[model samples]
Target chain A: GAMNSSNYAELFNNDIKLFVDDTNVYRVTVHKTFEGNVATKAINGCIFTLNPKTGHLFLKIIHTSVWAGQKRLSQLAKWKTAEEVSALVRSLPKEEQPKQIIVTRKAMLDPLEVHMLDFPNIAIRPTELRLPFSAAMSIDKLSDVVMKATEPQMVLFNIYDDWLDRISSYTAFSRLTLLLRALKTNEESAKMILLSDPTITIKSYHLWPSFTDEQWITIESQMRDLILTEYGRKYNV
Target chain B: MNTVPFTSAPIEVTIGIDQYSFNVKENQPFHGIKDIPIGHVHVIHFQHADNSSMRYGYWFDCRMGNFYIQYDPKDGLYKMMEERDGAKFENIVHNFKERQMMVSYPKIDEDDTWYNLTEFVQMDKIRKIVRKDENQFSYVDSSMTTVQENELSDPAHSLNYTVINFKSREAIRPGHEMEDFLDKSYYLNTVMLQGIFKNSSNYFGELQFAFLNAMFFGNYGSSLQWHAMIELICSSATVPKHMLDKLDEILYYQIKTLPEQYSDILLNERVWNICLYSSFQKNSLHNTEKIMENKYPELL
Candidate 1:
């Protein structure tokens, strides 16, 4: 069987809620309120760095349950500022500097300032919101993409949860198409493709999903890249 | 989704006094040559007692109680079959007749020929099965879910393997949850190696953290390799990211703690590809290859 990370049963907590504000800025808010220090202590929970060689900005979010409702520090690190993030990067030794960096602050909100102030040589590209956690995005729009891609034989009442929760609700073939749609749109909306739940998003399909050779190669390369980057960080290779 | 002709879940049926379960081995949806809506045929098998089993190509309509049979895996739903010169059906009754669901088919092989092979089903049910037990001792204090078992074919043989779909109830951390989950996945995969095959050599088992290729990292040691893989796997998810740094420390600790037991079998060429594939980026692949080749010249 083909190995799928999403297919494995892994826990996801609802302690944090992710939403984009009116200005198209992503915010992850905790369920319970707490002190600014809680957010301050949570500051290191997310770290963003700029790699001079690759020009790739990495967002490294640390997970912690120290918040009011057992929330992760990464959940609150969204509120950090570019000025604060630069100091964190500056503290590391020159030799220990990241070839790839993790950005915990508003790099996603203001990548331009992050580039201009933090690393002058880095390009002024918008920071990509690549995190393990997912937030709810334009579900209706994403729903339409998968729905049209699916053209279901049965009527779906709730596209948000029901279509995702019910067994045999969609063909396995539609997943890659949905993934392709999400990847195409992820530059504008990251959560559109970030998996919500393993039980719902991963195993919620019948038959093996179909993949075109092109689609397979595209996703396969993305997986390969992510896997290598992650393992490299582990060994510092 | 149209109800695919087959299901990934196992179906239970009583064959004689002993009960057996039929599971779909491969995830193929059946179709006809002309694209006719034929019931999907899947490679199906059931494990009997004493580590014995049987495999068949079974076409099952989503609504049908009994399966339509094929002798081998179908290229498509229909293929041409030539008539045997002297073929005959050997009828074997249950010695007594009953209204229970039962299947009887011929024993066409010439040696030690039984008249027929048959299964008498008193009742059957299809449901997900979960197991929890002491096998999880070193892995997790919390329960580990063991989901399903299926038979896979090896050249000259077949083996039964179990798939344990594990999801952490809490964010996976280094000390307990992460170790537990990794240990559970490894223990289960390795136990399957021991339980069925009895010999851990040659035969293989797999674990999936994120990518298919990287799971072999978990296969490293008596348990440490799986620990490595699972750590990397969880690291990929980065759910509980603090342990991200602890992975190397854990490796160092395990190696020093069990110095004499450390096995270099993980250095096997077949397994090292996962490390190389997982660690090297496309741009740096050639450079890293040379560095690794220089470090371990024999690896090339």
Candidate 2:
């Protein structure tokens, strides 16, 4: 609960439609219309500022066989040779220009980095898209880069409409990584904080299809009790 | 190429530090007339989260339900304004177009640029209390946004209170579309004081000979001071109170005058207001208990 302008929320949008035009240039249209607030506004609805020269990705077909949507749109990025893609990467101006910031899961970006080097700045973004419900249902490792620095803070995460559709549609499941993260946020760090400035927190999760009134009312308290009990045992020890 | 019919994209108006965007559509988006009576306006997809998401047509209704505020000057009794019904597209847009949507904030920051108010605008050391409702109205309008006075700075001395909006426990969370009217009211109160003190012959050497401070500026740079100032301002029939009155004026005006959305519900209990009021009440009780325990331990 570090007070960076009180607190903020975001929706995690995944799976953008990136495609190549007749000119052999890729245009990223229609990104993941997501289910959070700040995350969506900051990450989604992003009109990519792509470089004209570099957008002509000479992707290495060998490295991309496993890439998501490779059979579909990525196939367009498959033709150019490795060195050709390397030269494609080398050809773009390295100087600062309006950046095309992108966010996707680790699986796809790790492979795409073979050619899309100029996008190194955006290349490291952490969010799951290609795995769909698979990545979401799993241990939920991709939600990375929580503020390592301690703070006199406020924190919030607003789950937007149909936020849990990723897993909800597939099965009845929930993720605990965020909950653990919220509870594990080293409380001792802010001993000096004013009573008025205690760290604020949000611990919430969504299901496969929805969090109905009963679902939220029941599960929300479950979470509250879950976290409370977990820490209650260790309050003194 | 098949030409499309002649149509106009609505006028775009970006509001506030968050640069939140909304489009105002009309037969004429930009009317030359100043006081344009609005028909129906669009609230886009984001209904400000003031609604329960089931609200239709994109406009949010921040349901404060039905409640009123009353103040007593002598008792220093100040009641936070109860949020009324949800938003009206007409009213919300009117203010949205005029860039008045800024005063609304939720408990949390979302999609908007968050400004860390390490510094603030305010008058140093000078305080005033306007007991009459008439004075409050003229004081707010005559000061900024209108020029009822050639010098809106008059009758009141002003200077920057560095601590404004910086701190003091104000619960704004999840930042629903319905941020309490008073959070920004207090913040804006300091802003008005800043304007009141700006430029001209007001230099006047020192700030009213000063009350003691932890800093050279009279605890001027700390948020704790602004917190105290806000306390004094909220309770008294004074400058900040009127500032708050103005905010409610615009917001309630928007809520009441505008047309309701299609999926609009009975917007009585605003999550934001309830949270603020509940927390505010809790603090009052807790503080009262703490004070009694500390002062009269033997009485219990």
Candidate 3:
């Protein structure tokens, strides 16, 4: 409760870009981008603007373009170079006249939506952009891997600064997990249990003094990598 | 599809001194650990009238393996620190400061973090990694942190804690250390039947009991906590019975005899299938169906 609402949202886990003031006129730009998966192209530095408030949304794909084509992000997605796409439009009237676009970190729009501003503008909004990644965790099944540090293991954790303003999601845990995978540690990928799916948050505790199941830790991302590298029977990282 | 009741009463009744308390409620057991919706977080504060009180509590969201806690980590800590200190179960005690000091603070939305392995947990899952000193919570990576005087403008940015960075001991095979560990873990489930048959009684409770594999569990000597994860990562083909009994007997003995301990093996559904796989592998994959039937009559 000590945290204020404004600060609370700032501290939230989901990556988000909330537009404030001047009635959504400025163009927003993105500085850093983490692709949700290999399939989807991340918007590293793009600028765009629109408004669901006035029902007068617009797009001006500046740097890079984003869409869901090679990947099923959206039914049809496309990209364009800045010269190929401009900020706002001079085609619409004054009431609808789009002014110059300003891009701050996180300003984004689909240059793919082909209608309205018109169309071919991805149709997705900056506020609604999701982190392209999803952890492949099993909800109802066996623990997939084994823990093998010569001693008891600890799954280390830590977070990135200002990590909250990146994405949005339909599920709470899903979003939470995206951030978890983003957790960085000094430990290498090999030593830490490789979790294939970061979502089902696998945590092992000492049954206080002693406990090892020997049969059930969900195969982690690191473990799978080890299996591949170790396929030579040498079983190295 | 069922409601697991969380009661105020302790599942195990005891009339002794208690330093710290960690418990799941009793008399309510129609439980399903999936898909249950969660509401607002209520912080339960254990306060005191004797000019002193400690603040902390932890909860596990089984749905996503997310664990949450509300602790200040300094003084008046009841059980957690004590238990970690090797305090025998039921021997430690916490004196209630003469009155009702319990209070709850509900979290306003937007307070949760997504990157956390535990959905609701944004703090402290790391600090448990290692203890450089008496306090495991005291250690954190100071290298990456540039404390802006570490802040003291007010109470707004006051909630701070530890983040543990884990490291591995030098491996004989260099990178293959993790693999070596996995192999060692896997080997036991297959050919090891040494001490499992020591006791003849069934000790597994309603759920497959998860008692300590002692030698492998995290203790003061080590805090790895990655036992059995081998099975999660195993791509092997597996049967079940004697090993089950081994676990049952060992844990049964340990539970009744041990001073203080936890009773979970980080268990899950695939236990049976893997057992069958190993049994098949051990017997050259013979009598597979019959072995299955005899070992697990419920499945048949």
Candidate 4:
């Protein structure tokens, strides 16, 4: 009858589907959707995983919408910059920037600075292509560290959709600051920010599927906006 | 004095003690004892004719030296045997013997001298009177009035005088139908009082004082006292309060409440009233805030 709060972590890991990316980040996704009509408002929902040890992040989303679909793939890419990712690559004492960053656009891409800066243009045939440098990191090493870390750690995201519509012209500018701030705050924890477009239709595929060219663009834009609104103005970098 | 012909019919009498009524049938053929004390001179009232007439019989248990006396028909009048003439008493005694011989030992010869009466009452007539209520007769002393006087060397000579309408007599065995003569309250009160007295010896009069207090205030702590007593009893045997409560309930509601049609059946009301009044008073006093505060100082 007497139990500590940490006991729930192990139970969550065992009972739920926990996934890890190439960045040695752990993520727990609820298998069954919350049973209720109100679930539609937060549909295509999922909980991201965090590394209790190195504090890395892994995003798990409902793969029911095209927009969310691309967002998930972008999040996977962002996890590569996670602390655990750097540790796995033997770059622990330093930052291991995301290599071979790929950008795809099925719709008109938003002109965002962080997107342009972090994931610059790479000449390739299709929207997807490998970057130039590959860090000396093994997928097995990433998985090992991810599995060993404490499980089901939660990372909360605060997204603002109003700014996206009202300040559409200035959206790309404001979004860069937001994305960098979110990335800085989640540097040690490697927590991912999910920028949701309230105006856009949210489906399981958008939140959970592998990203395509245009879907990736929309997801990146949304994340940038979230970071800007959350902490960009509050503190100097 | 008109001797009233010493009616051949066994007289039925109801004597009220306190609130209880004991219906007793008197002057019957020799029946065996029902309520015989082990050894005591116990006074029992023989009642007949629905509270009409009552004869106080002193029972001597030649075994245990305990004695008791109960007022017959209330009014606190003491009726004793030595106070009355021996001649009239002899008639009654002789008739009683004749009836006993004829009805109790029927095989005795008819011409036996004991069967011959010098008095105007013929032996056969005395026998008929004894047999008047054969259903009420017994030989096992199941319902007889017998007094046991403890260690009385000469029971016949030990007869104490002061015989009025009340009489004292020595008997080898109790008179028949004595069970019908005593009320349930007599037994209950006697048992309770005896139990209290027995404990008072060890408790240094604390229990005695409490009992006297209870009696005076009409608020006997009978329930509380009995509860403590029952605990001691229960250690040896399983004495369920429910059984005693059931008995009391039956006596109160069923037997005690008998109407006029059953009036011929004598009832003792003295003990009944004591029980009812004590129970009522006990409840009232225990519930009273002031009395409770005084009784339980720790509450303050």
Candidate 5:
């Protein structure tokens, strides 16, 4: 429960822009853009204001623009550029807007209505947006393929990190045979048994006593690259 | 849609020498030590004076091995640093001051990244007897109360303590058979079930569909659990004896006639139909309905 304390100081650092409206409510600009699956034109740079009382994060988005942005500027000038999007954020109600967005990470990797910004087209359905890209299967599931294909089969191994826990509805499993056609992994055998534990709340990975220092390092490096390269192609700037 | 009389009574039992004292109880039929054969898992119903309500406990897990307890009637299940030396992940033991201590495993969520082929088997379902040589054991507390209005919803109430106890060395390792099954077919039987359920509403309703989903997509493991699932489903009204026979006939026909990689694309996108073009046919394609019936009639 103590994890609820809002890290507003970290949120309002020099890299991010803060806007104070007439009501003196502190609104911060998250310096990232998210493109929706249906809406070809992405919503750039989300605006969020934290509730001082509850420490809850609130977001505002131009509903009509996300859906109609792809229509062209001749139809609507509001979603044409970054400045117009910021202007639209200033016009919304000062009391705070949609509360479903997850701001746990600046990247906003959780089962958000649609990744921090309330995109009208995509928000109708609930979607868990993982960093790199959103898909029917999990990125971890894809990385698991790499773990299995390259294996020193005798040693048992497991993997964990913050994203695995902070995100909700995460299922656990041992291998990734299903997604091999679409994804790729390093060829080195990184032998680890995919074991599931429902009680874990912290990030960690484990290797058996037989694990060599260089061997485990290769596993970590390969896994990191696999997720990063696959996800980074789209989600990162 | 049925109700049975339920009763609880305190039983005279011994749980080794005291690490802590517990008030134990059981229902009628009194499942004794003999009922719990070498490979079978047993449930222990226990409550302590310090606890508020009854707790359902699960005995030795094959994967987690056993809990090492130090006995002293006065100590009451307290653990020192030395107690944690060989402790496996997810073991809940009492700490030195006699408070509860739980070992946390590495956190993983399905949505975090891309590839995880593993599914969660709730702690209770994963428990089975793996240690044949050692008789003494430890159990993890379910912390679930058994008394309920709809006993069907609570597996603890309806199924009671007895669970899958098939004799096999392979059952000792969780997901051993499932991994083998998955690797061999990639997704044959998994997709076959999907094809059967795709066209018809009469065979499976919402509850049966959900139950089958949990069995395959979630709690799936071990050859024994698969057989257990098939038996349970066959016994249910959703798939009658005739429909089950027809389904098996179709499976046997497909196994012989269809290419091994035929379902590859369907599994990739999770589409239902076995063939790429059409829905499941009602009558048999090969009419060799007795092929599977003859091959593994004992299972049917």
Candidate 6:
């Protein structure tokens, strides 16, 4: 049980933007031992971090030789007797034994530098939103770029970046804003309308062409009325 | 079922010897030596030991024979004397020397009746003459001969019997070949014979006759040869005994009707029957009756 080595100066930073179509998809960065004076030795080992909840570990290996050497040393130490040691030694070809036998004088933990970030939650309103053709094209572009990224790190970052951009700029109208604006114009009328339009019926089902002005106004009115009737004191004129 | 006490105690003894050291103990009887359970028969093995060689004294009924042994005294050996009757003792020594070692029993008299077949000529000739003209004979030849008569009679010439006193001696051999032979032979000859006779049809008169003839003629060279032919005829017939008796009666009737030319062939054919019947009895069909029954639907 070696203590975690927190020497981060050797870490390499890789800042990369992943795009799908014209939209920013995901942003990601990979860190490894930076080529420097004091930090070079820290990059010689591998480190794996485990998730307490999911039990998924993030693994990073610095060099393959380190792994091989550790395995050989462990096997040698496990052998109990001189005879067993001799037998094992004899089993290996004479030429290969000298090279394959591993000798380790010290126990050390040389951690590989790593950073991982999970995606954040985002909300989207389906009814009022009508994305512009340019924005939609950008989304398509960003999605394509992220989907085609060669490395997993680049793919993840591009995907996240594209998603965040699409969410913030894709909407035409906010449902909360429409409802609040409608409630301001009609106070008592809104209360009466809210009581009468308790069911909040507005029928227009189409995704392609934008809704007519009258239909939009009707939908907005109905939504405002329903909310007022549900919370009367808050909407009281 | 009755448990017959054929041997009340171990009847044989073997002697072990080291140079100037002698040890004696009762040994298991040879594989096949036995007293004829019927009739008064006594068998014993007497061991005479010294530092170098050992002698076995086999006494059966009243006759006797000796089996000599010479072995290195330093060798650790557990010697065993198998069953030894006069007949078995001599047969074993003869078999061991003649068959195994390829030597002849030296002390045995070359003129001994057991070795030469002329001694029992009078008895056999008298029997044949009596059977030829029973009306002419004044006395019956039914009495079981006494010990003296047995001694006087030669086993070689006896034709149908070998006089064996049950008390005898035998040399101990590491390999029990002689003992095994004796055991198997006795079981086949006596026990199996009784079982066969008991199980066979009542019409087995000719089969019986053929069997007797084989026993009488069973010598060193022409043993059971004639009997084999007779047995084959019997075995091939729908009713073996019927065929056997018919054959015998035909031959005898022929001899009776015309005693001149056909008599020789008839006698020769009877000998053939003797050999055949002997082999037939030993056939697997008869030997493993229980096994055959399980194996074949026809037998079943």
Off by over 4 Å in 1: A1-237, B1-174, B177-300
TM-score of chain B of each: 0.21, 0.19, 0.23, 0.22, 0.22, 0.19
| Of 4 and 5, the candidate ranking higher by lDDT | 4
Question: Candidate 5: where is the Cα deviation over 4 Å?
Answer: A1-237, B1-39, B53-72, B77-136, B142-300
Q: For residues B160-241, what per-residue lDDT tens digits would candidate 1 score against the true structure?
A: 1123233322222223332434234333233433454343221222221111111112221123234334333332322223
Model 6 chain A worst lDDT run, 10 consecutive residues? A108-117
Task: Tell me the tens digit of each residue's lDDT in model 2 across B144-163.
Answer: 11111222244342223333
User: What TM-score fits each model?
Assistant: 0.18, 0.16, 0.18, 0.17, 0.20, 0.14
Q: Model 6: what TM-score? A: 0.14
DockQ of 3: 0.01
DockQ of each: 0.02, 0.01, 0.01, 0.00, 0.01, 0.00
State the iRMSD of every prediction, in order shown.
15.9, 20.6, 23.8, 59.4, 20.3, 44.8
List residue ranges in candidate 3 displaced over 4 A.
A1-237, B1-132, B135-267, B277-300
lDDT digits (tens) for residues A1-237 of candidate 4: 211233423312222221122221213343545663231211222323332222233433322242233334434434222322223223322233322211222111221112222223311111321211111011222223324434332222222222323333234223433443444544322123232433444343222223344764666665556545556657754
Tell me the tens digit of each residue's lDDT in model 3 across A1-237: 122224434323333222211111112333544654332233322222322112121222222233323343221222232222232343444454322222221222322112223322222222222321111111111112111212212121111111223323222223233322433221244324434334534334211111122312232334444545555555442
lDDT of 2 at B47: 20
Where in model 6 is the C-alpha error above 4 Å? Answer: A1-237, B1-300
Model 4 chain B poorest 10 in a row by lDDT: B164-173
lDDT of 6 by residue, B1-300 (tens): 000111211323342111111223334222222222221112122233332333321112212222232222354322222343556555654544333332111222342322121111222233331242322111111122322244545333332321222112111112322232223333223332334323222213323322223222122211232233234333331334444444444333222232243233323444333333443332323323333233322312
The TM-score of predicted model 2 comes to: 0.16
Best by DockQ: 1
Q: What share of the true interface contacts does candidate 6 keep?
A: 0.00
